[PDB]
Structures are given as structure tokens and as C-alpha cells.
Amino acid sequence: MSEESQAFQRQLTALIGYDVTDVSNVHDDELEFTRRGLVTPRMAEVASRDPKLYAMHPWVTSKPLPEYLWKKIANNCIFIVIHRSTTSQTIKVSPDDTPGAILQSFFTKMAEQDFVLRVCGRDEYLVGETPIKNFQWVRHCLKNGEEIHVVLDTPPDPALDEVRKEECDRKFRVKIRGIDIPVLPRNTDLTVFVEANIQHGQQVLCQRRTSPKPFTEEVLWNVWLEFSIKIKDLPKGALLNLQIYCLLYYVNLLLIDHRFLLRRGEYVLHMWQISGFNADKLTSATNPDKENSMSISILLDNHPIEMPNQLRKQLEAIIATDPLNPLTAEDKELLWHFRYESLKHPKAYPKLFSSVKWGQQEIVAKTYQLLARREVWDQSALDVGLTMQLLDCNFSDENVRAIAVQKLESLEDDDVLHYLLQLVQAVKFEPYHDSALARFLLKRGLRNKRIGHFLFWFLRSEIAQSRHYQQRFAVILEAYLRGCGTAMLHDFTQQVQVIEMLQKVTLDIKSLSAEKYDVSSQVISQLKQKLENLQNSQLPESFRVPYDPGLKAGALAIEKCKVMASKKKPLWLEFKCADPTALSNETIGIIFKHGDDLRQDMLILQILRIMESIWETESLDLCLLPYGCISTGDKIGMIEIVKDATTIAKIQQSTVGNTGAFKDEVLNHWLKEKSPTEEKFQAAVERFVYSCAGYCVATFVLGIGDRHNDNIMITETGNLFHIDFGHERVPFVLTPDFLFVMGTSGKKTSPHFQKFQDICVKAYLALRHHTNLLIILFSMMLMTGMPQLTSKEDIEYIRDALTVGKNEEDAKKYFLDQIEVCRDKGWTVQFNWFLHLV
Ligand SMILES: CC(=O)Nc1ccc2c(c1)OCCc1cc(C(=O)N(C)c3ccccc3Cl)sc1-2
């Protein structure tokens, strides 16, 4: 192994944020085994991909152009403006024309083909045999009444993507020797015992406890715990979960390893402490802090492997229930007995597999037999909600999860991007490091630069702040980095250097000030100085914007930089675009913040993006504005600065605003004053109506509707939008001023208001057609992103919000009433936010 390669592993370690060659925290070889196992999948995808399309990563879709976008094209023509150094002729185009085709209606239309079309000021290319209406940039330009500006240039050299070459029927039992913790001191000396559970898909097959003993820094039971389950009956993927009750600490050990061998021998496991139901409780990793943590020693000495009319009605009823409906023992017995009928309803699959007795070898075998004749499933139309249901904490069986991944195989790149964060979060529910899901993400990321970019940041986000999963995600990220190509690698290196520098600055400045005071010139002077120093050497000529990889940021515009006045003291940075072909002088705004887990915001924003695509599948545009947000490290990251935007509170505050008085007409005035004409003003009011509806609906369903005015913004162009998603009542925010813009006051009516209620209802029922998708996303969001959330009651909110079980009439009713409540409450809740502080 050349000294060069060691230097390389060193480089990867600095991009990843973890050393995957570190063996300090392992009790076996699963991780190393996996690093090797992933070599094959990587090399296969790298060698399979087309160098040209890979270099230009065109962003395309197979979905049809929505109705609301055809409206802007009634002439069946689209104008593309090509530029190549001075003047620029604007080619008339047909929504069906191909990039190579408009190149024909050009050269000859003018009068050597080794050239390509690139969006101006972006690393974005319109290539491949795809209709121009199928390009995301084209649809983005239409939805925004913007012109499509392109530049003629030379295709990127695929050479630049070169990848470096690589080179017994007995019952199961376990002995609990004892537990050891360096220092126990809490308050009153209590007693302690160990609870050992055998689980599979978060289902306890068998449970045993030790006798209670006095809780001292070392407790020695030396006791055998014999379980009712036979060794032969242990399903692969089953965990021996060990817990300390006083619940203080937990830890897990996979009973059967990555080689199909029964675990055996002595183990001293460092446990995780509960912070006084969630994915962290399922980890096979042990606490990396060996110095201050509880440990438990154990010994293992135990290689393997026609329906009557009315009953059919019961079965179908069971199948129609929602993902969260509990399955009764009767239900499970039915689903199982009628196994073969059940297998004819893809939607029954999750309910059916939750009906399997996983602690019985014979039954599991019958199950694989069931999966053998999978014809109905394989030919079923892809249902993302259904596929995700089989990837959650409820299924630990490799094969069951594999058919889910099989269905994902059929997703187009545009959809993978929509679900990526949730798939990645779903890797936490995998019992082994090497899994079909992990390999699928690897594969899709290496196949496409955009998915790879995001995959990188999403993995890095978790590696930096999750002790429970950093090891696994690190192995996966490394596998990806070893295949993305030198170009991407150089880019990631730049992005990481930049954010690392800015992290230093952010922290230092937060120190030079109190917690809550204000922002003085001492602190601002210090900022501009520190930045001035970086601009010289430290901060690279350019770098890709992490939440918008097609955008290249150049030098900082130091005169415009500053520290924002908020509890936390985040930086307000602005950069020049490093692309001369850019169509404007507008800088690139980025907010840098330390002290908050931006992962929750990423999660919400991403679900918001999903809600948009769902509404798109229905021909609806609610004008949401899910700005870029990326967790880059522990409690720190970057956020996109939406241009020409203010807080609804700030609009209020600039006018008197003593103690938080509130006037209904302020908003309308602000909008009228920022509009150059009445035309632009009407457009602003309309957009406000649409965006208000979208955020009201989205926010009610996700159960985040009750927000303070300071957490909601609006663009000068009328787009309302929510922010700061980090962790008496009202369902959402629709205050009298919003109402005022709608032409109503004092519980009255109006054309825009009526239009609003219509949009809300259309939006709401449009989501109910996706009820399962939303429910499964909501619960995965809770399990992998929040603290220890009740696997029932917290999650049940969404079932109620989507009013599952009701017909259309009762739903509309429920929401309209919801709209009335905000009205009756007026300014009440908003007003309350100020007093709680006094
Ligand atoms: C002129 C103008 O005020 N521009 C401006 C200010 C703030 C934002 C913005 C534009 O757009 C990007 C969307 C956004 C999201 C934010 C957020 O999540 N949090 C949590 C937050 C809240 C307050 C302060 C800082 C932050 Cl990061 S802040 C913010």
C-alpha cells in the first residue's frame, strides 16, 4: 500500500469527520467487513455510468407538465435565449423540442457540434435526449415568470471524474456477570437490575430480568438468564437488548452476526445513557466514551439456518386501515391464515409481515416460501408510502426489507431526490451495516452527482452529531467518496474548508458578547476584520453552495456581512457568484448559525418539498418557499437567505410596536409600498393568498401550526413563508392582518378570502389522497429526528389532523372550522407570546 494511499485515507477522514480505520470502539469486524463488501457495488456503478451524462448530471423528470404551467404556454412555444460573448439571439422553441434539436434550429437557422447548452451563472446543463419541458430548470423558470437564459460552451472533460484504483434445540441463555460505572453519584442511593430482551423489529420475543441488587459502582450477579426461545428459533437480525432500571442505560448486541454465526464469548459493552421509542434505542454500536460510561459484562456459549364472503370482508377491512391502526391478535391470525389471499394486495404487505411470528423457524421459513411467488407484488405500481412502511423500525427481516428496496429501484432520479433524507434516516432501522438499502443509496448517489452531493451532506450531518450511527454512516460515506470522482472530491474539500473556517469565526464571535444584549460595533468590527483575514488565503477562490450545488460562490462581500441580532449570534454572509456568465450582480446570501440542531429544520423543509410534489401530481401550486438549509456539523450549519424578505413581526415592530401592539392594516401597506405598480401589487396579494393557504395546510397537518409572528416571513413579492422549525392553542397562523390583505375584517367575507378557503380545501384533500405516505413520513421523522417521542400519542396527532376515517364532507368541515378558530382568537395567542417573557 503506497504511502500515497495512506495520505488519501487521511483526506477522506477529514471530509467524513470520522476515521473508519479506527478499531477502538468495536467488538467484531462488521464495519471492516462492510467496507470491503461495499467495494463491489461501488465499482459496478462507477464502471456502469456514462461519463458524459455523469459529467453534466442533467436534472430531468418523466412527470407530465402540470396544468398550472401549461397556462403560461398557450402558443405552444418557449423562448430560449442563447448567449456566447456579446449579442444574444432568442430562439423560439416547441415544448417538445430536444436540446440537440434546438441546436439544429440554430446552426442552420444561422450558418462544430461539440458544444453544449448551460444555464447562465450555474453549473447546470440542458442535455441528453429529453424534451426541454422535462428539464427542472425550464419548469423552475416558467413557474417564476423568468426567461430561460443559456450560454453555449464546451462540455466538461469526463477525464476529470477519474476514480483512483482501489486495492441445537436448547433454549437460549446468557450470563450477566455484572455492571460497572466509574462514578454513580446522583442523589438518593437506589436499587438496580438488568432487563434482557430478545427483539426483532421492535417486538420482544422473550424477556428476562435479574434479581435486584444494591446500586454501587460495581454490581456482580454472575447469573444465567434462560429464555424460552430455542437457539434454532432465533431469527437473523434479532437483538439482545440489555437495559438498566433504577431506565438509566441501554445497549444492544446482534445475536447473529454478519456471517450468519451465533454470537459467542465474553463481552464488555459500554452503554448509552437515557436523557431525562426512538431510533437511537435500536443501535448495535456501543458508547464511544469508555471513560465516563456504564458497562455491562456478559457471557455467550450457545452455523444455523376459497374464503367465505364475510371473512373476506373482515380481511379487506383490516387491510383498509391506516399504518398506525393497531393489529389485534384476531387480525394477525386472519392475515396469516389467509396468507395467500393477503399476498394479492400489496397494501396488505406491511400488515401481513407484522403478523408473522418471527421467533418461530418454521413460520419464518413459510414466510420466505410466501415471498418466493411474488408475482403480484413485482408487477404492482410503485407506492412510496407502502415501500417506506417496510423500511421502518417494525421490520428487521432482511428479505422483507429487500423487496421494499426492490421497488425503490424503479424510482427516477427526480424522486430519489425527493425522498433521499428519509431513506438515509431509514438506514438507522437496518439491523446490519451492509444492507440492501445502504447499497441502493450508494448506487444512486454514484450514478448522479446531485444525489451524491446531497447524500454526502446528509451522511456528514449525522456522522457529526449522532454518536449512535456515526460509525455505520461513516463506512457508507467513505464508500461513496471512493467513487464520486476527483472533481466532486475537490469540491467537497472546498466546501468543508470554508464551513470549517466560518465555524471558527461564528464561535469566537458568540463568545465576545453576552447571551442576550444586542450587537455592538466592537463585535461587528471584529467580524469584518476576521473575514478580511480569511479572504486572503484561507477561504478558497470559490466553492459550491451546499444547499444549491449548481451555484458557485466566489469572494465574500465583506461590507455587506454582519452578525444578526438574535439569542444565538449567527452570521449574515454574502458572496459574489464565481460565474461571469451570471445574469445578475445579486450576491449569494448565506446565514451561518451555531447552537441549534438544523437537522430538524432540514427534515421539515424536506417534507415541505414533498408536499409540493404531491400537490404537483394534482395540478396544484401552493407557492411554498422551502429555502435551502443544511446541517453541516454539531448544532451548526448554513441557511439560504431569501432575497427581498422580512419577518411579519419586523413589519409590525417598525411601527410603534410597544410591548407588541398589533394593527391589522400594516401588512397591506407594506405590500402596496413595495409594489412599483398596482399590477405588481395585485400579483403580490394573490401570491400571498396561495402561499398563506399552503403554509396553513402544511403546518396544520404536521402539527406545527401554532407559531409566533417572528417565525413567519413574507417576500416583497407577496410570498408568505415559515422559518425556524427548531423544536390556550390555535391550529395555525391566520391573523387579522393576513385577513386584511384578503379584503375581510371582523368575521366578514370576500372574493380573495373565498378563493383562499377554496384553495385550502383543495390542498387539504389533495393531501388526504396520500394519507399513508404522509403518516409513514411523519413517524419516521419523529423516530429519527426528535427526542424520545411516544411511539403512539405523539404520532397520533397526524392521524387526527388528516382526519383519517372520514369522508370528504366531514374533512372540509373540519378544516373550515379550523379556519374559524384562528379568527375568533384574533391576536390573542400572538399577544400572549410577549407576556410569558414577563
Ligand atoms: C432582510 C432579512 O431579514 N432577510 C432574511 C432574514 C432571515 C431569514 C431570511 C432572510 O431568509 C432565509 C429564511 C430564514 C430562516 C431563518 C431561520 O430559520 N432561523 C432559525 C433564523 C431566525 C432568525 C434569525 C436567524 C435565523 Cl437563522 S432566518 C431567515
UniProtKB/Swiss-Prot annotation:
Region named Catalytic loop: 703-711
Catalytic activity: a 1,2-diacyl-sn-glycero-3-phospho-(1D-myo-inositol) + ATP = a 1,2-diacyl-sn-glycero-3-phospho-(1D-myo-inositol-3-phosphate) + ADP + H(+); a 1,2-diacyl-sn-glycero-3-phospho-(1D-myo-inositol-4,5-bisphosphate) + ATP = a 1,2-diacyl-sn-glycero-3-phospho-(1D-myo-inositol-3,4,5-trisphosphate) + ADP + H(+); a 1,2-diacyl-sn-glycero-3-phospho-(1D-myo-inositol 4-phosphate) + ATP = a 1,2-diacyl-sn-glycero-3-phospho-(1D-myo-inositol-3,4-bisphosphate) + ADP + H(+); L-seryl-[protein] + ATP = O-phospho-L-seryl-[protein] + ADP + H(+)
Tissue: Pancreas, skeletal muscle, liver and heart.
Assigned GO CC terms: cytoplasm; cytosol; membrane; phosphatidylinositol 3-kinase complex, class IA; phosphatidylinositol 3-kinase complex, class IB; plasma membrane
Compartments where found: Cytoplasm; Cell membrane
Impact noted for substituting residue 593 to R: Loss of kinase activity. Loss of autophosphorylation. Reduced inflammatory reactions but no alterations in cardiac contractility
Major place of residence: cytoplasm
Pathway field: Phospholipid metabolism; phosphatidylinositol phosphate biosynthesis
Pfam families xref list: PI3_PI4_kinase (PF00454), PI3K_C2 (PF00792), PI3K_rbd (PF00794), PI3Ka (PF00613), PIK3CG_ABD (PF19710)
Binding, ATP: 589-598, 624-632, 721-727
Span of domain PI3K/PI4K catalytic: 557-827
Keyword Oxidoreductase on entry: no
Keywords: Angiogenesis, ATP-binding, Cell membrane, Chemotaxis, Cytoplasm, Disease variant, Endocytosis, Immunity, Inflammatory response, Kinase, Lipid metabolism, Membrane, Nucleotide-binding, Phosphoprotein, Serine/threonine-protein kinase, Transferase
Effect of mutating residue 768 to P: In IMD97; loss of phosphatidylinositol-3,4-bisphosphate 5-kinase activity
Related illness: Immunodeficiency 97 with autoinflammation: An autosomal recessive disorder with variable features. Affected individuals have childhood-onset antibody defects, cytopenias, and T lymphocytic pneumonitis and colitis. Some patients may have features of hemophagocytic lymphohistiocytosis.
Name of the protein in question: Phosphatidylinositol 4,5-bisphosphate 3-kinase catalytic subunit gamma isoform
Originating species: Homo sapiens (Human)
Gene name of the record: PIK3CG
